[PDB]
Amino acid sequence: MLDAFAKVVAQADARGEFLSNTQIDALSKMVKEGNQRLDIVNKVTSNASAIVTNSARALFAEQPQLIQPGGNAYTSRRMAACLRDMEIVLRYVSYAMIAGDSSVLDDRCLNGLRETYQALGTPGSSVAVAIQKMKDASVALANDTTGTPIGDCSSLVAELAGYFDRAAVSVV
Amino acid sequence: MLDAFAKVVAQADARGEFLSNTQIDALSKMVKEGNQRLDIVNKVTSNASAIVTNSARALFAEQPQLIQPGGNAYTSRRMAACLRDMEIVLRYVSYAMIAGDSSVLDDRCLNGLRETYQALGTPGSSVAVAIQKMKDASVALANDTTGTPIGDCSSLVAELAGYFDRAAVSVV
Amino acid sequence: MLDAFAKVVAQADARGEFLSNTQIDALSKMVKEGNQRLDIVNKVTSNASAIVTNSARALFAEQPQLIQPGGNAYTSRRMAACLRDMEIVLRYVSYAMIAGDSSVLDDRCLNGLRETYQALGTPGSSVAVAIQKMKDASVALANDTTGTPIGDCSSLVAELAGYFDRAAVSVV
Amino acid sequence: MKTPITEAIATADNQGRFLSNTELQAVNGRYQRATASLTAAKALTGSAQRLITGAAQAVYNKFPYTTQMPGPAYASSAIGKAKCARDIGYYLRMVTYCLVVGGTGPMDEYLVAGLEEINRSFDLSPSWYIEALQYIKNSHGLSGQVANEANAYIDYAINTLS
Amino acid sequence: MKTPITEAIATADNQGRFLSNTELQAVNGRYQRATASLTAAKALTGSAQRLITGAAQAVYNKFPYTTQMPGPAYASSAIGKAKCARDIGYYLRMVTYCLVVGGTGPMDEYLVAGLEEINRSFDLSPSWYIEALQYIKNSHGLSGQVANEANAYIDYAINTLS
Amino acid sequence: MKTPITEAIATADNQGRFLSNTELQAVNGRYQRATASLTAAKALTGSAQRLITGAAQAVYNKFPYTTQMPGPAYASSAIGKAKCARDIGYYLRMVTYCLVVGGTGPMDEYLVAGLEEINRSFDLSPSWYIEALQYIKNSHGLSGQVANEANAYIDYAINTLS
Amino acid sequence: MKTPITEAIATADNQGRFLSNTELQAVNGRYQRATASLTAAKALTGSAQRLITGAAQAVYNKFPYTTQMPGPAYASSAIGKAKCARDIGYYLRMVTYCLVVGGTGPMDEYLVAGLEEINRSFDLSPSWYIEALQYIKNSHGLSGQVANEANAYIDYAINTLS
Amino acid sequence: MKTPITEAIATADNQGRFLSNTELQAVNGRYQRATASLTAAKALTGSAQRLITGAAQAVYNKFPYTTQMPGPAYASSAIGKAKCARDIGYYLRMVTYCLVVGGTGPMDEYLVAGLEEINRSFDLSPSWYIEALQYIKNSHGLSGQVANEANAYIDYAINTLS
Amino acid sequence: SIPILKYSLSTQNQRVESFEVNPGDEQYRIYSTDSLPSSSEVDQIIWAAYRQIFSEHQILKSTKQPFLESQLRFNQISIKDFIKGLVLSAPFRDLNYNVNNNYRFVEICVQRVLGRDIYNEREKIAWSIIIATQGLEGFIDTLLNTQEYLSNFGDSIVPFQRRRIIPQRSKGEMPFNLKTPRYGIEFRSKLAATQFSWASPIRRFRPQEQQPKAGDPALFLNMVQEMGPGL
Numbered sequence A, B, C: 001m002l003d004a005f006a007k008v009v010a011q012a013d014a015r016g017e018f019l020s021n022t023q024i025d026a027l028s029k030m031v032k033e034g035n036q037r038l039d040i041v042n043k044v045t046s047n048a049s050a051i052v053t054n055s056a057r058a059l060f061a062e063q064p065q066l067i068q069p070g071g072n073a074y075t076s077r078r079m080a081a082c083l084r085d086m087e088i089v090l091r092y093v094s095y096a097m098i099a100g101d102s103s104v105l106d107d108r109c110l111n112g113l114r115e116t117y118q119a120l121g122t123p124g125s126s127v128a129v130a131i132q133k134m135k136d137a138s139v140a141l142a143n144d145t146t147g148t149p150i151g152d153c154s155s156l157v158a159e160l161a162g163y164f165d166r167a168a169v170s171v172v
Numbered sequence D, E, F, G, H: 001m002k003t004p005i006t007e008a009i010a011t012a013d014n015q016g017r018f019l020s021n022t023e024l025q026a027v028n029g030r031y032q033r034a035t036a037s038l039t040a041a042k043a044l045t046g047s048a049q050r051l052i053t054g055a056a057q058a059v060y061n062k063f064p065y066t067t068q069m070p071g072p073a074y075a076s077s078a079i080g081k082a083k084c085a086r087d088i089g090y091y092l093r094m095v096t097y098c099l100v101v102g103g104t105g106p107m108d109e110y111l112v113a114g115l116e117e118i119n120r121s122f123d124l125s126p127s128w129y130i131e132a133l134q135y136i137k138n139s140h141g142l143s144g145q146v147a148n149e150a151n152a153y154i155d156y157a158i159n160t161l162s
Numbered sequence I: 001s002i003p004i005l006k007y008s009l010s011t012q013n014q015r016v017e018s019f020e021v022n023p024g025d026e027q028y029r030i031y032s033t034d035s036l037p038s039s040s041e042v043d044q045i046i047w048a049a050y051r052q053i054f055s056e057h058q059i060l061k062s063t064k065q066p067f068l069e070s071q072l073r074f075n076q077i078s079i080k081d082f083i084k085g086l087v088l089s090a091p092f093r094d095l096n097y098n099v100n101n102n103y104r105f106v107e108i109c110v111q112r113v114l115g116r117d118i119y120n121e122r123e124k125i126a127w128s129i130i131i132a133t134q135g136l137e138g139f140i141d142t143l144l145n146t147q148e149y150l151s152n153f154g155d156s157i158v159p160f161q162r163r164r165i166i167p168q169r170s171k172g173e174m175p176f177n178l179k180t181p182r183y184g185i186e187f188r189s190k191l192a193a194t195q196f197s198w199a200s201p202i203r204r205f206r207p208q209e210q211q212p213k214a215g216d217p218a219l220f221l222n223m224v225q226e227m228g229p230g231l
């Protein structure tokens, strides 16, 4: 897989070029916000079980036919596979937040997941609702200042919200 | 896999229902046929090599191109693999007879068989003639009264010959 | 795999025939020129490293866009894989020279190779140029008269040229 | 499914064999037991709502904090009491499915598989459901070999929660 | 050996399971049918010498070249006739071992595993042994479900030779 | 097929190697045995129907029950006699196939794979085909190394039949 | 590649686990080091044209036979001299790629993997490149912990050639 | 090793088979080629005092830096000269073992296995050994198939060095 | 030194957990020598390994390896060496390796040794060069020494098709012997003694497949065999 820094080298090797001065200074900008990026992923993985079990509880109150008899999350194994998949999606999103790009999320989490859900009868549009519930439960927690020095890291939160949006549109 | 008592449980659960007294009374009509169903698979198992070789001998007497040089059952490794196929199909029709429905036959035997024979160049319409000759060898054996008490098992003969029909339309 | 002798047998078994007297006599003509067939694969094998590395050097002189950045032969791993693809193909041509027919060349080397290069992004027309550069390099060695009694091998050399030509049209 | 029928087909198909008398005797033992095992399912179904609303009240007696404490995991609201009697009826319905099938098939697929992961996430204590199954084990009213069949699946459910 | 009891343990040990009602019903089907198969093994044991000498004579009427052709494979000498009635007794003894155990376990271990290399090497014909076993099926004198149990293991030995 | 050409490619192929001088000597040994090996394959090709009908008659003299016993396995019909002489033509054609490639390639692939399985199914004794091959071994009339090459593959079919 | 970030994700993903503080302490050590690695990668890039021609002239003094001996593998022609400085620039470029990523990730896929087959086939001696890399380590002009990061990936490329 | 006698045994041993006619012709191709092999082994053995010190000087004439450049890898000392002549004697002795055995068996297990790591570590170039091997192929002074067999193992050693 | 080339994973059943304590009838029968089996039960390990590597149609008498079996019965080789010895056997090279190319032979040996399907098409491309440059003996060693083999099967368990059926369902993925036969649509054409590639159903003037209708007296035939007793 690639991270953000190794993505720039892969662009520069294919043109056979040394890196420029502006490409160096763009890379030293990602180093400067490294402590604010590490502080986000720490905020998300520390509450990772509560993101999943509360975004699921809001989903089954909004779409109550998923836990009625015949519903896709009705039995104890179908209920536990639903909480498994939300935890898998949230895990690879946390991986893509320290790397800087969605290379591990596309290859190791999303590849073939839409076709897996069609073959199962799992409603793929309902999985997208539960990922967007995990999106703003994580974004609202990443914007919480209790424990961090005060400052503006809103560009990083708009990047984390794009990994959740990437997995939400790649599941339906 | 499902048996005949597990097929009614899966229909009932899919709507979150108990089983009514009318449904229980139809499952104890299936139990009372229990010893006649066990006599039918005993007559098929005990004569299983005469079902296969008498009906393979009949298959090449009336389609003698299959064992001529250039045929598909020529060159005795392909002759032995041809008799293996008939014992395999007879094995799973025997499994579907004690189970009471054809779900172990459907996905462990017949699933992908028509597309297997097209990749080998095996005439799949002649495999269906091979299954149809084991069909009435097995039916004439199950209508035969030797070793059995007096009574009735004629709705079970019509059921055993229906698994041979399902196996024969799935291969053409 | 088949040689020239078992090619005739497998064709005769599909008709149910013995071999005719003109088929045994055409087989014993292969035995008569068997020493000259072995002298050809003695010249090719003994210089096999120099056939690959001289024709690969001439391929990049005349196709200098393969080893420019972005080209298919630009990295250490993509360039050494270009060298071993030539050594695989040169190896399976010599397997088709002592066998007498191109049955080991087609089954083990050329089957499904055009579609593999299309999936990798390898320019398949340039692989044909490298095979043709190895063709005349080993024909020039086959026509060398050093360490041999002087005779006519011109029908054998025109057969070796047909094995490289078959490999070059089976890859684009 | 853990039916005695599908367990017999599986041991024959493991070694690529026809069904001998080893497997026909396993099927025959299901039919000899299916008489007592089907009158138990008829009597538990007919007393379903009596046993469900009784067993819910026995949990609220032994665990009275489950009706007082606020939060989504407890039966302190009108929705929490509807979802609590839903779960008693789930455990009762799976027992009756095992009695009409023979063997612990439906309980393993529909109930036990994944139960430990659910009861940890939604903070549902498994001691509540043990108390609810011990009520049904004492109040179904059956006797003889019909209660002996019924209690073998109440006890199988208690061993998974315990 | 493959018995109905060791095939219920092995399917429960594969699942990491205690002995459920799926497995208790299967062992109970063995105990129900064991009354009919323990009298078949008692009635085949007590009339064994009538069955061995009869079944060896039935091969000699049907294939009379086996008494006339010279060579070590045939029953033409007195040595080769006692080796025939030895072998008929081996097949009849394994059938009684399968009736007391239930299931084709003793002859799967003692007889059929490696049998084709014996018949190929010493030039013995498996149709001599089918004719001997078809005599014992027609002449054991059993009736009811006692003959049903005995004939189900005669036909297993024929199906491995056929 | 198992051929001294193709068993020489398939030792350099299993290591990813070019054909060294180890494998060119194996091809050379085939080329200087092929002269005596190819004259046997056309001396048996021309003398086929003398050797076929005589060998089937040699089975009928040694085992005269095969012309008398009724049933599908025996040559007591006009159909069964046609299938007997078809079989001797299969065995003789595979011997001429092995002589023109060197070594037991075609009869390993076309005849002996699955041969034991179909003899037992269709009740065909392999002692019949041994006697038919002892006729061909004595009556091909070849001499020198032309008889050594011929008898090398007649004895191979006898060794795997018994 | 072999970034420390991807080498921390790969351990958490193998266990199927979230990112703990074991991984965030690893990535923090990358960020506390990258202020010296990115000053070394910019200082080598801005002095590259002095470093390439100086290292290419140094191997002509150490091994003068390269500029005299004929053959395509030597720098005696203008074609061979342009391909020699091309190779020095390929080694310096992967060094500055490894500094901005951290760890020997880019030069593994792009320079080291398959290097031994290139030097064997085209007959390029790896001791020519070791003499060129020892020039850059001597006179890149850096000092402090900036020069420690540059010599860490110079000596990695020397260790693969040696 | 990799004699054609041991590669015919190990072929038949990996198939669980007696030595068929496919293997005996591979053995007889060794015996036909043997008298052109055992005379080249006899001729190179006595002429080794000239062919080693003649080939050592052929390297110093093409690569004269190996006598002047200081260091342990070059033959600029009496220790390095005597170890350079030792290396050519390894290559010549391995050729006479491959002629006696027949095929590239002895020099595969004794010489070429793991050689690329030795040259890369001790900094010594394989192009020095190729110029020594092309000398012996130009000056062994044989003709006929005695030279064509001897040159087939010199050319195997050159193809492993490049 | 030419590492293997990188391919992407795909979503499969075996990459993710089944929360299944107490498995059912679709649990797929571990055959292990860690349970100390007797002679009758080590025959069942051997037949299960033949069925997994070969087909059911290649368990002929001429295919069985009698000396590889006796080294397993004496505790000289493990089950990982039995499985390796069946792939490098002479029947497997003759009936399977010679009638496939390098890309379809990889997906046979991934499905039958690793017990899972291929991830994508590039995984076939990545492994088919291990065959062409090192042989079958080098390809099966680098496939049995992956962490996918040593974690699932170890060295004393026969492989099986991992996670074929989902615990609620009755219709699972196709079995790997019906999905991938001995040879495919190439080598079918004329390289495997074949004509015409298809066949219409057999016609006949006695129809043999007549469906019964609603007044036919065989639908009431039930108690025709015998009347019930009583009064």
Ligand SMILES: *CC[C@H]1/C(=C/c2[nH]c(/C=C3N=C(/C=C4\NC(=O)C(CC)=C4C)C(C)=C\3CCC(=O)O)c(CCC(=O)O)c2C)NC(=O)[C@@H]1C
Pocket: A066, A072, A073, A077, A078, A079, A081, A082, A083, A085, A086, A088, A089, A108, A109, A110, A111, A113, A116, A120, A121, A122, A123, A126, A127, A130, I010, I011, I012, I013, I014, I015, I016, I017, I018, I166, I168
């Ligand atoms: C709340 C979530 C929704 C939902 C989920 C659901 N999914 C499944 C089944 C599977 N999920 C996967 C997913 C993955 N496999 C992987 O390897 C990866 C990472 C690359 C992922 C994300 C797979 C393979 C399955 C099938 C196999 C299995 O179930 O173990 C189920 C299973 C039950 C069923 O019958 O579908 C559920 C319930 N379903 C919903 O209703 C929610 C909207």
Ligand SMILES: *CC[C@H]1/C(=C/c2[nH]c(/C=C3N=C(/C=C4\NC(=O)C(CC)=C4C)C(C)=C\3CCC(=O)O)c(CCC(=O)O)c2C)NC(=O)[C@@H]1C
Pocket: B066, B072, B073, B078, B079, B081, B082, B083, B085, B086, B088, B089, B108, B109, B110, B113, B116, B120, B122, B123, B126, B127, B130, I055, I056, I057, I058, I177, I178, I181, I182
């Ligand atoms: C008389 C029968 C006809 C016939 C059969 C024939 N079949 C084959 C090959 C295969 N058959 C199967 C079928 C199954 N495999 C399974 O696992 C199951 C369920 C348990 C079934 C039903 C498969 C997978 C194959 C190919 C794999 C293999 O053979 O290894 C062959 C041989 C093909 C070959 O040349 O290799 C024959 C001859 N052929 C006929 O002509 C008859 C009409």
Ligand SMILES: *C[C@@H](*)[C@H]1/C(=C/c2[nH]c(/C=C3N=C(/C=C4\NC(=O)C(CC)=C4C)C(C)=C\3CCC(=O)O)c(CCC(=O)O)c2C)NC(=O)[C@@H]1C
Pocket: E056, E059, E066, E072, E073, E074, E075, E076, E080, E081, E083, E084, E085, E087, E088, E090, E110, E111, E118, E122, E124, E128, E132
């Ligand atoms: C019906 C008699 C026909 C007959 C018999 C015959 N058999 C043999 C030789 C052997 N039979 C066996 C068989 C078994 N041994 C076992 O341990 C078991 C399982 C318990 C079986 C089924 C074996 C091993 C032999 C050879 C060793 C021996 O017992 O002496 C022979 C002698 C053959 C010989 O060459 O000595 C005969 C004559 N043959 C007939 O003609 C009768 C029709």
Ligand SMILES: *C[C@@H](*)[C@H]1/C(=C/c2[nH]c(/C=C3N=C(/C=C4\NC(=O)C(CC)=C4C)C(C)=C\3CCC(=O)O)c(CCC(=O)O)c2C)NC(=O)[C@@H]1C
Pocket: C057, C060, C067, C074, C075, C076, C079, G056, G059, G066, G072, G073, G074, G075, G079, G080, G081, G083, G084, G085, G087, G088, G090, G110, G111, G118, G122, G124, G128
């Ligand atoms: C210091 C110069 C010495 C020298 C150089 C020389 N090199 C070549 C040919 C090649 N060098 C490479 C090396 C790489 N290619 C890569 O992509 C990478 C990683 C990015 C490396 C390290 C390759 C592949 C070739 C062959 C193709 C090519 O580039 O032309 C040559 C020409 C040799 C030939 O036979 O063509 C020379 C002369 N040689 C010297 O003598 C100098 C001391």
Ligand SMILES: *[C@H](C)[C@H]1/C(=C/C2=NC(=C\c3[nH]c(C[C@H]4NC(=O)C(C=C)=C4C)c(C)c3CCC(=O)O)/C(CCC(=O)O)=C2C)NC(=O)[C@@H]1C
Pocket: A032, A033, A034, A035, A036, A038, A039, A040, A042, A142, A143, A144, A145, A146, A148, A149, A150, A151, A152, A153, A154, A156, G024, G025, G028
């Ligand atoms: C933005 C979404 C947040 C926020 C982030 C900031 N964090 C700042 C400093 C800082 N953060 C951490 C946590 C993190 N870094 C680590 O190394 C580790 C684990 C080892 C973790 C969990 C640390 C240690 C530091 C100290 C470094 C420093 O003092 O700078 C920070 C300060 C400025 C900056 O780094 O650019 C910010 C803005 N703060 C917010 O207000 C929101 C909620």
Ligand SMILES: *[C@H](C)[C@H]1/C(=C/C2=NC(=C\c3[nH]c(C[C@H]4NC(=O)C(C=C)=C4C)c(C)c3CCC(=O)O)/C(CCC(=O)O)=C2C)NC(=O)[C@@H]1C
Pocket: B034, B035, B036, B038, B039, B040, B042, B142, B143, B144, B145, B146, B148, B149, B150, B151, B152, B153, B154, D021, D024, D025, D028, E033, E145, E148
């Ligand atoms: C139906 C196609 C036959 C036929 C069948 C009947 N069988 C009857 C009773 C019966 N069958 C068995 C054997 C069976 N049970 C087993 O447990 C096993 C395996 C070990 C087998 C093979 C037994 C033991 C019994 C006795 C049961 C009893 O005594 O009731 C039967 C009885 C009448 C009825 O049950 O109503 C019938 C009709 N008879 C036929 O005529 C056809 C040919």
Ligand SMILES: *[C@H](C)[C@H]1/C(=C/C2=NC(=C\c3[nH]c(C[C@H]4NC(=O)C(C=C)=C4C)c(C)c3CCC(=O)O)/C(CCC(=O)O)=C2C)NC(=O)[C@@H]1C
Pocket: C034, C035, C036, C038, C039, C040, C042, C142, C143, C144, C145, C146, C148, C149, C150, C151, C152, C153, F024, F025, F028, H033, H145, H148
């Ligand atoms: C054809 C492209 C050549 C050529 C070849 C001839 N070679 C003749 C005989 C011969 N060939 C070899 C080499 C080969 N045979 C082997 O047995 C082995 C090793 C196992 C090898 C590598 C040998 C050793 C011999 C000598 C045997 C003999 O003298 O027959 C040959 C016939 C001889 C003749 O015609 O006098 C021919 C024509 N001759 C050519 O002019 C081109 C260059």
Ligand SMILES: *[C@H](C)[C@H]1/C(=C/c2[nH]c(/C=C3N=C(/C=C4\NC(=O)C(CC)=C4C)C(C)=C\3CCC(=O)O)c(CCC(=O)O)c2C)NC(=O)[C@@H]1C
Pocket: C066, C072, C073, C077, C078, C079, C081, C082, C083, C085, C086, C088, C089, C108, C109, C110, C111, C113, C116, C120, C122, C123, C126, C127, C130, I004, I005, I102, I125, I126, I128, I129, I132
């Ligand atoms: C060199 C002349 C040309 C060239 C080569 C090139 N090849 C590859 C990759 C592969 N080549 C194969 C080839 C075969 N596989 C087989 O199994 C057989 C016998 C049937 C052959 C001939 C395979 C499988 C691959 C992929 C495996 C791998 O990635 O190593 C590459 C790709 C290297 C890469 O990193 O992508 C290249 C560059 N390409 C050219 O430009 C020359 C024209």
Ligand SMILES: *[C@H](C)[C@H]1/C(=C/c2[nH]c(/C=C3N=C(/C=C4\NC(=O)C(CC)=C4C)C(C)=C\3CCC(=O)O)c(CCC(=O)O)c2C)NC(=O)[C@@H]1C
Pocket: A057, A060, A067, A073, A074, A075, A076, A079, D056, D059, D066, D067, D072, D073, D074, D075, D076, D079, D080, D081, D083, D084, D085, D087, D088, D090, D091, D110, D111, D118, D122, D124, D128, D132
């Ligand atoms: C009643 C005895 C006690 C109680 C019940 C309660 N349960 C829930 C929530 C769930 N219960 C289940 C259980 C099952 N689902 C199944 O499909 C099956 C097998 C067929 C079982 C056993 C599940 C999955 C949930 C969560 C989803 C749902 O709402 O059904 C709640 C709500 C908890 C929440 O956070 O939503 C309550 C209140 N709790 C008590 O206090 C009673 C003592």
Ligand SMILES: *[C@H](C)[C@H]1/C(=C/c2[nH]c(/C=C3N=C(/C=C4\NC(=O)C(CC)=C4C)C(C)=C\3CCC(=O)O)c(CCC(=O)O)c2C)NC(=O)[C@@H]1C
Pocket: B057, B060, B067, B074, B075, B076, B079, F059, F066, F072, F073, F074, F075, F076, F080, F081, F083, F084, F085, F087, F088, F090, F110, F111, F118, F122, F124, F128, F129, F132
């Ligand atoms: C003649 C020596 C004796 C004899 C022959 C006989 N054979 C059969 C039937 C079959 N024989 C074969 C054998 C092969 N088929 C092959 O393709 C090959 C490899 C080329 C061999 C060795 C097979 C498959 C059959 C059955 C199908 C067929 O009809 O060919 C019979 C008929 C048996 C039947 O049940 O129909 C007979 C009579 N039997 C004798 O009595 C002669 C002594």
Ligand SMILES: *[C@H](C)[C@H]1/C(=C/c2[nH]c(/C=C3N=C(/C=C4\NC(=O)C(CC)=C4C)C(C)=C\3CCC(=O)O)c(CCC(=O)O)c2C)NC(=O)[C@@H]1C
Pocket: H056, H059, H066, H072, H073, H074, H075, H076, H079, H080, H081, H083, H084, H085, H087, H088, H090, H110, H111, H118, H122, H124, H128, H132
């Ligand atoms: C001589 C023509 C050129 C040369 C030779 C040289 N070689 C070495 C050192 C070694 N050579 C070997 C090679 C082999 N050892 C084996 O056992 C075999 C197979 C039988 C081979 C091919 C090894 C292992 C060494 C190192 C140990 C040793 O001293 O023998 C040196 C010394 C290098 C050192 O650092 O010790 C020299 C000088 N070098 C030249 O300059 C000549 C052109």
